[PDB]
């Protein structure tokens, strides 16, 4: 009010007036003036890494591999840039709260840290890459660990189901459902899934062992605190600690 | 993923010894006969559709029932993904060829497939069957005996190498069943 | 274990691709540098227990200390475990020598070496002060071949990059 | 752009190392074929206007009914697109035998080409009978070498296990 | 298997809510259209066999090159095997046309075809030659009923783009 | 917004194809269930303050305790809100009616309520009290349809099973 | 990732013709080279912390206010990421060396770096100062002109290489200025 009897002022209303309205991502606004493409090649830089730390070996491991079979590998990166841009599709408010959730829990996943926590906080895209690789490297995620015993199958089942109650609110599916968004691909995600699970088998029994305490050590470090009965569920069964996402997915 | 080389190792290593004369002999034997592996490797990769069509049709044409409604080659998708893995077979097989050991298809390929196979319900006679058509197929391409393509080279004898991409194929096969 | 074998089937296979004309020229190179490779690890497994002797007695023409308090010199039983460590590096690199990457040499010896060097106490420059020794004690007609000679230098500085 | 070079320094720098000797060996190997693959480029390009004559002739030697309705023959324009389509596949034959790897031609020719075909109506039946007439219209002695007609065969063939 | 009924329960499952009003307008509209899909399949499962004699003689009334080499014409067997694949289609038409979604002809049929065709080198502009036969061979007032004639034309023209 | 379109739409959307015959019967029964839902909005309409006055007078014909110390009966302003809230949720049965799913009273009155009825020291049991009124408080044949009826009874129950 | 080969092939490609003879004579000239060029690559990778601890505590040795408190070398973790990053920057320059097109090294580790050490606070200058250092020193070892180190190989001129290697050095240093 008191900007707009200034003669000074009636600029500044009108400029955060013009402001006000629009929405945008926390990816152009969170981080300082000019410092974006420093974030893209931050969280590229990120990735690389881990993507080092995974292949100690000039060997790829099972894992490392994109298509099971010719002419797969190109369906995998198409698949694999529609749900980039579908990334950029969604509203605003969506993009802001998946933000925070990613920024808590890059500050879970820092252990530590001035730079860890001053670096997560700053930049939007470090912090996703970085939550997204470092939990991808340490084998903490869904396609790989599934469940051996039926109990435990039934379980990871279970939590499967209750975070798809995450990645539908209300009926109408996400932005962020991405099958298809062509004439075809579904089969190929399904075939893809399939043989991943197969090539989970393929690893190294050392690896099998490194991979069920690392899911173990992911479920409770960010999704249980306290929660003893949760803690007994860790503890025992690594499919269910396997394939817990923070609701920054929405996969 | 372990080759000839890594397989004189291994063992030297589980010997705690150095390599020595013989084995390095052996493997003299390998280098040797290096650019027949080289041009073999070519012969199978160069009939890739050609040979999963043929062995997987040939294994349809023999046993009738897996077409039949009911079976497991009924569904299209299911057949698609039949020629999917006698492609994979093919393709370990010849990594099996420029490898010299058999590491890379029994670490990559041949593990788990069994207890894959049962827990699917696919016929373990009908996977052996398409396994010998593909092995029968790869060695008449790979000595150059195929009935409507006849590549120039350089005569020579390469039976061992033969023997040795039939005893890969005998392996999966016999894995199978 | 890396070699020209493994590195290029091991990308082909994450690519899914058959085995096309790249990786075949990879493994043709690998088949023409063969020579020289079997060459060196001949001439070492021959006189191996001459590199082990001035090997380890020329750490301890070097550093003292080692021999002097608790550090690592207190028996013949710790310089015995000295000298079979040392055998241990060079049948290694007659390893790796053998297979024509740093693939045993580095899954067999480097890796996590470092946990147990820093853990037992055990310092790297004494092994790095041996192997510079070793690698300046070669000849270049007489020993092994100007082609033979180079691989086993390759081999040995690797270590040296890996320890330091 | 697959090739050697490429797939040993994309391995290397996965791994995050400095490049070992086995990825010496591999680009030993690429120039030691180079000769080989190089002649097969020279020799294709001098020739290759005969192979487009005798490649898009042969194909409507085969099949009629494209010049039949409305499926591809019911111009000198579509005929045109026939010919410069078959020297579009000839000219990444040319590239990926100098690249020397199956990259150019795989990235530039074979990525997302069968939704193309399915979509605009394209047998690939008609594209093989072109490719298995131009390498059954090899010469072994006089054409290229015996090493070089072999690398030509092999880039041929991939196209061909690339379409069916 | 795709229905109105199986995407609106799994929708709802998805969701993990009851199944609310909404679902139950969709599963009153499918039992609103049932009696035209019904009809459509009373007379498809009538007169089928005509249908697959004029389906594949109309597919062999165009492209001759089929029963030219090695193709496909080569035997009673594979002009067989054109009849019975063209029946599978039918029946698959006569299956979601009961359903009243796409559900069985795309999880039996259309789901990983496009490969088996590609592979065992089957063209699929002759199957869709079939089909748009068999879609200008209606009658409107004759042959089902307005509303049934239309769900046939829907499902096949489905088939068709499906293909192409 | 939850309804039959957008249901059909999000799920084939979700699955990339363009909209197959099962959407259309989706809609079509939208369509054929729009005459009860229509009637039933347009009575709502018309005496919904009277709804407002016995829906809330109701509430307060039981539970008194309201209007007794600092519960919420403390001033007209208090009363005031509690007839405002009825008003809207009375308005969402309204517009729920008109779109025919769950959506806009989902997505505006139950999602989140939860909270801030807890947080503001809400009675849920006091509004199922109003809303339990309002629904014993029908007529079959003379206060809307048979059809009709039914459709308001489902959206008011929906409510309640929402706050119960 | 481009080589020299994929550098014609791509010139080439924009020039929408074959291939022809002046460029595969220039690729000749490469291959003709290229064993120099693999002893090169040889000589900058068995120096790896040799040339980095070199260089970087000759960076610190010129400036000595970088180890000051308040600086970028102060804390021992910014002094290994400081040791971290000039092992990167010589790591895709011996990339650039095999490669023989720096391709590998714009699209990799050259492109965006400036506004990532803008955004963090490492002084451009020196950093090229580092910069500059790897490259007096990688042409010393390239040229096997050091003082430290002399290794016996076949004589010959190796200028024109030396000039390519300084061109990509100069690529990095000039780039982050
Ligand atoms: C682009 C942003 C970006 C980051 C923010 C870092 C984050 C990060 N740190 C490490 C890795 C590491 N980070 C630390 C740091 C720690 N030491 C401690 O005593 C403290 C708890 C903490 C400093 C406050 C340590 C010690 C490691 C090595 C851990 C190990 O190997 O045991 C790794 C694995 C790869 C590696 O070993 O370097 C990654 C990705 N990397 C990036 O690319
Ligand atoms: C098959 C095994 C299996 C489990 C073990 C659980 C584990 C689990 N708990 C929650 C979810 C939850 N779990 C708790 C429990 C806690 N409340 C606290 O005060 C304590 C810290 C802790 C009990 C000791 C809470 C409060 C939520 C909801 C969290 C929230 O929405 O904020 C969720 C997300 C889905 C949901 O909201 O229900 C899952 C997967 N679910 C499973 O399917
Ligand atoms: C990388 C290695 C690798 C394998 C070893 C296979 C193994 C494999 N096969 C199938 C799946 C399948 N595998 C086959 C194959 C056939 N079944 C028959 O009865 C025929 C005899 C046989 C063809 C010769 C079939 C038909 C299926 C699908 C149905 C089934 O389980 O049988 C699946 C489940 C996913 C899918 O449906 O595709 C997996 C993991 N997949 C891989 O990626
Ligand atoms: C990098 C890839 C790579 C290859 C694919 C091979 C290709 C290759 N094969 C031979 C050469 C040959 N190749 C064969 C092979 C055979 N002949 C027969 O009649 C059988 C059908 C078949 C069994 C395998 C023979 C017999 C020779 C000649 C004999 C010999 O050189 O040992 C040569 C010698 C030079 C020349 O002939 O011009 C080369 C380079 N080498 C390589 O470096
Ligand atoms: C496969 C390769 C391979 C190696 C290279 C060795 C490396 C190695 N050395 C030791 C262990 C040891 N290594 C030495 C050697 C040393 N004594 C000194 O005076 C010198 C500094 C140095 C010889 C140059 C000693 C003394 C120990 C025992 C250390 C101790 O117990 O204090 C150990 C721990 C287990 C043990 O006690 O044996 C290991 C893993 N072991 C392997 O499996
Ligand atoms: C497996 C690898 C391997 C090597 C690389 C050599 C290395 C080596 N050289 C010598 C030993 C020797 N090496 C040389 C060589 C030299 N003469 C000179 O004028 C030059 C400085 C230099 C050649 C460039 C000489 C002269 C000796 C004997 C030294 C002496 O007895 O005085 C010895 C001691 C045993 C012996 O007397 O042979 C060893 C281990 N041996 C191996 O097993
Ligand atoms: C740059 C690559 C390149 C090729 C791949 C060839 C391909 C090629 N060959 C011929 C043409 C020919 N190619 C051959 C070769 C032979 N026919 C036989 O029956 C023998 C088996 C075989 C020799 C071993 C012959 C004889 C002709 C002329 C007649 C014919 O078509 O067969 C022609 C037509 C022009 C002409 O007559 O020369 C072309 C384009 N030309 C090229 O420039
Ligand atoms: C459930 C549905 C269902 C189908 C629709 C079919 C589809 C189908 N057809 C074939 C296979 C075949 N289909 C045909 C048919 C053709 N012959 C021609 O001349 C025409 C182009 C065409 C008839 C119009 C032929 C000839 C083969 C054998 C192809 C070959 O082996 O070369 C195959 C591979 C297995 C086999 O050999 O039988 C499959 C899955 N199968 C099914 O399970
Ligand atoms: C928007 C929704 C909506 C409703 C559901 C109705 C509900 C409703 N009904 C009445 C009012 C009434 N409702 C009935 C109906 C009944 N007669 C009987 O014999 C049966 C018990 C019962 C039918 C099953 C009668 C008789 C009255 C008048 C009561 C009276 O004046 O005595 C009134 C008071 C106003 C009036 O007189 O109309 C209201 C609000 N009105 C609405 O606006
Ligand atoms: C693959 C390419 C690649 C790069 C180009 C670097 C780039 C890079 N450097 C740092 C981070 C850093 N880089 C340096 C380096 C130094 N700072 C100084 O003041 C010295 C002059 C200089 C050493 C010579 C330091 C000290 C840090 C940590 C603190 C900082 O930001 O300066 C970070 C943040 C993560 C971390 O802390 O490690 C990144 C992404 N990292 C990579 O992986
Ligand atoms: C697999 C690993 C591998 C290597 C490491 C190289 C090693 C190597 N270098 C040369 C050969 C050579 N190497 C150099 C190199 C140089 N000379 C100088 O004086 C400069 C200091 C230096 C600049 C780089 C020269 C000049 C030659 C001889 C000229 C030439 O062959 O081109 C030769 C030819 C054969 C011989 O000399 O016996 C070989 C095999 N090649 C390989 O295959
Ligand atoms: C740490 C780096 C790393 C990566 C990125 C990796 C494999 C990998 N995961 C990939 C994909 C991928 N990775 C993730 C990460 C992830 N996020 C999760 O919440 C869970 C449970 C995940 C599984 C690891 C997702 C969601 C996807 C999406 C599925 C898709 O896009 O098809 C890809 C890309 C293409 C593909 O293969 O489909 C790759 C190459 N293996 C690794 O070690
Ligand atoms: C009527 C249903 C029917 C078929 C379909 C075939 C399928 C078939 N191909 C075989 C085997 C076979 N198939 C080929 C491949 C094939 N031949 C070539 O020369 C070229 C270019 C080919 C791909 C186009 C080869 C090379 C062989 C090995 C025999 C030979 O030397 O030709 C075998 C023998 C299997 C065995 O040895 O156990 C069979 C059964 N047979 C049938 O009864
Ligand atoms: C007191 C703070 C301080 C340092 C730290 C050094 C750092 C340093 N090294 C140089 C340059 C340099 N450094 C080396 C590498 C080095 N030499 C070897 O023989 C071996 C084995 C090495 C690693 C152990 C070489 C090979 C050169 C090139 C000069 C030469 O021929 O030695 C140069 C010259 C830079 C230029 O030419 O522009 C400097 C400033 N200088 C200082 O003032």
């Given at each position: ?26 990816d ?9 493409p420093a974030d893209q090649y931050m969280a590229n830089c990120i990735v690389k ?71 997560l906080?700053?930049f939007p895209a470090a912090a996703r890459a970085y939550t997204t690789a ?118 | ?177 | ?164």
């Amino acid at each position: 009010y008191f900007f707009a009897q200034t003669a000074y002022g009636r600029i500044l209303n009108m400029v955060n007036a013009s402001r006000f309205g629009k929405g945008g991502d926390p990816d152009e606004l969170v981080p300082p003036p000019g410092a974006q493409p420093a974030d893209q090649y931050m969280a590229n830089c990120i990735v690389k890494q881990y993507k080092a730390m995974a292949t100690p070996t000039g060997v790829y491991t099972t894992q490392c591999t994109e298509g099971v079979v010719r002419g797969q590998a190109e369906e995998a990166r198409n698949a694999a840039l529609s749900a980039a841009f579908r990334m950029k599709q969604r509203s605003s408010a969506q993009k802001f709260g998946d933000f925070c959730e990613s920024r808590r829990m890059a500050v879970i996943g820092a252990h530590g840290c001035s730079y860890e926590e001053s670096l997560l906080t700053k930049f939007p895209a470090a912090a996703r890459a970085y939550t997204t690789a470092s939990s991808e490297a340490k084998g903490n995620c869904v396609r790989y660990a599934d469940g051996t015993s039926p109990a435990e199958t039934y379980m990871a089942a279970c939590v499967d189901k209750q975070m798809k109650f995450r990645s539908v609110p209300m009926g109408v599916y996400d932005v962020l459902c991405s099958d298809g968004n062509t004439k075809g691909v579904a089969e190929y995600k399904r075939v893809s899934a399939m043989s991943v699970r197969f090539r989970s088998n393929q690893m190294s029994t050392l690896y099998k062992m490194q991979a069920k305490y690392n899911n173990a050590a992911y479920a409770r470090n960010y999704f249980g605190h306290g929660c003893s009965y949760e803690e007994n569920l860790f503890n025992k069964y690594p499919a269910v600690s396997a394939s817990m996402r923070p609701s920054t997915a929405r996969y | 993923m372990l080759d000839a080389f890594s397989r004189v190792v291994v063992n030297s290593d589980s010997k705690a010894a150095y390599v020595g004369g013989s084995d390095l002999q052996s493997l003299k034997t390998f280098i040797s006969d290096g650019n027949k592996r080289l041009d073999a490797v070519n012969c199978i990769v160069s009939n890739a559709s050609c040979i999963v069509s043929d062995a997987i049709s040939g294994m349809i044409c023999e046993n009738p029932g897996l077409i039949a409604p009911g079976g497991n080659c009924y569904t299209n998708r299911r057949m698609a993904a039949c020629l999917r893995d006698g492609e994979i077979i093919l393709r370990y097989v010849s990594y099996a060829l420029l490898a010299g050991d058999s590491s890379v298809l029994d670490d990559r390929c041949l593990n788990g497939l069994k207890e894959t196979y049962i827990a699917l319900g696919v016929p373990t006679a009908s996977t052996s069957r398409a396994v010998s058509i593909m092995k029968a197929a790869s060695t008449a391409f790979i000595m150059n005996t195929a009935s409507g393509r006849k590549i120039e080279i350089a005569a020579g004898d390469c039976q061992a190498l033969q023997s040795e991409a039939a005893a890969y194929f005998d392996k999966v096969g016999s894995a199978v069943d | 274990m890396k070699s020209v074998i493994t590195t290029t089937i091991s990308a082909a296979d994450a690519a899914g691709r058959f085995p096309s004309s790249s990786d075949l020229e990879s493994i043709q190179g690998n088949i023409q540098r063969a020579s020289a490779r079997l060459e060196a690890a001949e001439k070492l497994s021959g006189n191996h227990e001459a590199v082990v002797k001035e090997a380890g007695d020329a750490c301890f023409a070097k550093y003292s200390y080692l021999k002097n308090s608790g550090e690592a010199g207190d028996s013949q039983e710790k310089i015995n475990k000295c000298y079979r460590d040392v055998d241990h590096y060079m049948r290694l690199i007659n390893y790796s020598l053998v297979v024509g990457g740093t693939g045993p040499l580095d899954e067999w010896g480097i890796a996590g070496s470092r946990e147990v060097y820093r853990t037992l106490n055990l310092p790297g420059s004494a092994y790095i002060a041996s192997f510079t020794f070793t690698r300046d004690r070669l000849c270049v007609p007489r020993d092994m071949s100007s082609q033979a000679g180079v691989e086993f230098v390759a081999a040995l500085d690797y270590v040296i990059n890996s320890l330091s």
